[model samples]
Target: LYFQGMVSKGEELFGGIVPILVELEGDVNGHKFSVSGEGEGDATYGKLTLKFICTTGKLPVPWPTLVTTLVQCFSRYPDHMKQHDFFKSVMPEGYVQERTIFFKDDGNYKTRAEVKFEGDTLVNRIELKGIDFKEDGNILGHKLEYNYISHNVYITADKQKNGIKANFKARHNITDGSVQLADHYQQNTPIGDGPVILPDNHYLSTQSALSKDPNEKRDHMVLLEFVTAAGIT
Candidate 1:
């Protein structure tokens, strides 16, 4: 009910998603993933550089599982937002996406997940470009463009498993449009744009939505989700 309304309004207002290029370089519960790409505007519309690497429980997941989990994670869109909790509050419902990319054994790349809203469960669509066989593995940059979706459920599970800690940090870069700033780092910040929770020190930046208006301080618009799940447990 409430979540649905929020989604409608957010899309109505900010649907021109500032596409991003994602790169994942860490382990989530002992499974390591690596990724890197260009978040800036590419040679085509809905195209952005995409790359990735992945493993589950210290072992590279077969193409089937890798593809499955990636899509499963994307299925939870706007409902999965976390950072400032604003996405869950004001926008109510819609979708949120976190682009995660990783590397493979043969020097190929892949996407971890993409979330969006659809029907009751937030939906997700994923593409593991080179998982079929070593043949798809090739080390090269991409000029791809596409909007993948993910929903909210993924956020819930993430919180339960990776409980936010003091030293946590998330980064976003929007390199298209009329925004200007040379420093590539924003430390000790907060995230409030999407539908999630972020304590202190979390960072999220929007390309066109950022405001310099003296009357409004909704720069990051962070959402903070709370839970009792401690560290890597």
Candidate 2:
């Protein structure tokens, strides 16, 4: 397979995701899966990358499987997030999606979706894209401007349910609004937000629903909030 990407210094501050991009062409099996748009490494050796386990001597050490996954990691780098005002700034249409490994297992046993912020939090989302395919492969393009996903996973006293639902929405509230066709789910979003994680034991609070306060307005933008329940009811 042929891989096409770039090489650069890792982020000056975060210093986590390896900033290197792989470019190579080799044959593993019969499939000539190219890696032209593959992305950054998931973990790094401070300056490189990480992730490999092979104790079973009988296995051939799936080469394509490994490289493809590695390339997929590079595909998700939100290198453009430097322009975001905040973590919640990523709207549905505002999401600048990379080559996403998140879509890999989708062809198999799949339920809904997964999204990461700062590459730490693992949460499910209502997929507005990645549902349809193109003639050349990859997600189809459209004009829809809607998206939603739970933020980080919230810990709870009850072990039964994933407590404290925090979600982000696009076009939920704005100065003006218009209804879109159900097909908007297949539309593609932009690229700006990167993967993110939350700090440990963080308490989430919200203003009273009846409280009155106003700025320019909370319209036509990304609306992020902590979803909570009353009690054991």
Candidate 3:
């Protein structure tokens, strides 16, 4: 369509111009949590308001610090993280700065586009109508497929715009993008791995207490993973 119907007003998927107010609440591990934010605004910046409380102790965890760290991570790595479920669920704005990568047509007819994220950068590789091409800088009409070694996160889109405008799933559940992002933290995330210890997680503690196993508690520790997932309602 060549940019036809590519940019529309008030569209939700493949990026949109409509401003949305989001509020969510739920329990993760043993804590009840809530968050509020907007999907669109000035600078296209999205903000998240999150709160968490332990059910047993009625204690508040250090959410502000953990949450701020998560936001900063997303801002710094928008290209890769944008397709994550937490990012899609919260739909935070202002995280993306500018177009970090681009593929241009190179006078050759191509059928597909493949982009990969290794660590913090995206690697471009392409295959055309059953032909292999050198990556010397060329582009053509293409589709998108993504592959990565992080958190078992794998996503594919049949359409170019949908692929370009891809966001994580609607809910931040264990089987979705949230878990992949969580895996980053649990496996000792690369970018400074920010919080060495998982933040305040009541679920980990509850599981430890119930299992009577200290290792269980240690293994399942609290961090932004649970915090983010909890607020993803």
Candidate 4:
């Protein structure tokens, strides 16, 4: 796993996402995954470039077990959002913008998952493009996109035979609306907008939401059904 952040020394004088590009890859307990994407934000507004990858785990669980969990995460996102506490911490105002699940063989197995979230004029989307389950494990591809008003983000990730690879390109509304941030990294001069206004309890409400935790035991049980379907011991 890898994490990085760079920022200029200055006070933000506007309200909008700052653009950023980031990539991440790692393996845990034989479960390999990667994510790459761009994102933008200061302390208020937010954006993210989206890319994701998943490979079979070495555990007793089958490859499709993880796949089923992934699809369920999208299908029941709105109802069980607290399971993803980290995401809500950053974009508290986010809400389900869209969701779709594609069935395979006209049965309960889902072949694809598409989900979107929107908040404060920003949008982030994730899609499981393909999934192929093998006897031992599975291979998968995914794409992610984030948009803040007019700016667009790009990201990609995939499962490789040897390993996983993910990459992304994203930016906040901080620099010039160009292809790359290094091209124009100067801070924008606040000309039209003044300071932002918000409800009095905004901070308190955000804190409460961020602190909430999901029922880990319940979530694990929910995944048990998929585990059985995948024929994992």
Q: Which candidate achieves the best TM-score against the true structure?
A: 1
Residues 34-55 of candidate 2: C-alpha lDDT, one tens digit per residue = 2211123332221223222222
TM-score of 3: 0.22
**Could you tell me which residue pairs clash in candidate 3?**
44-94, 45-93, 45-94, 46-92, 46-93, 46-94, 105-139, 198-222, 199-222, 199-223
lDDT string, candidate 1, 205-230, tens digits: 11112112245332211111112111
Give TM-scores for every candidate, taking all chains together and pairing residue i with residue i.
Answer: 0.26, 0.19, 0.22, 0.20
C-alpha RMSD (angstroms) for model 1: 18.5
lDDT of each: 0.26, 0.23, 0.22, 0.22
Q: For residues 111-226, what per-residue lDDT tens digits would candidate 4 score against the true structure?
A: 22122223232333333222232223212111111122221111111112111121112222222333211111111111112221111110011100001115422111111111
Work out candidate 2's RMSD over C-alphas.
19.8
Q: Tens digits of per-residue lDDT for model 3 on 1-233?
A: 35433221111322322333323232322344443332322112322222222223422222221121112222111222332322222121211211111122222121222222223222222222212222332211111211211112122221322211211211112222332121111111222211111222111100000111244322111222211121111
The regions of model 1 sitting more than 4 angstroms off are 1-61, 64-105, 112-114, 131-196, 199-229
The candidate 2 region of ten consecutive residues with least summed lDDT is: 179-188
Model 3 misplacement above 4 A: 1-6, 10-20, 38-40, 43-61, 64-181, 184-233
Q: For each candidate, C-alpha RMSD in Å? A: 18.5, 19.8, 22.1, 21.1
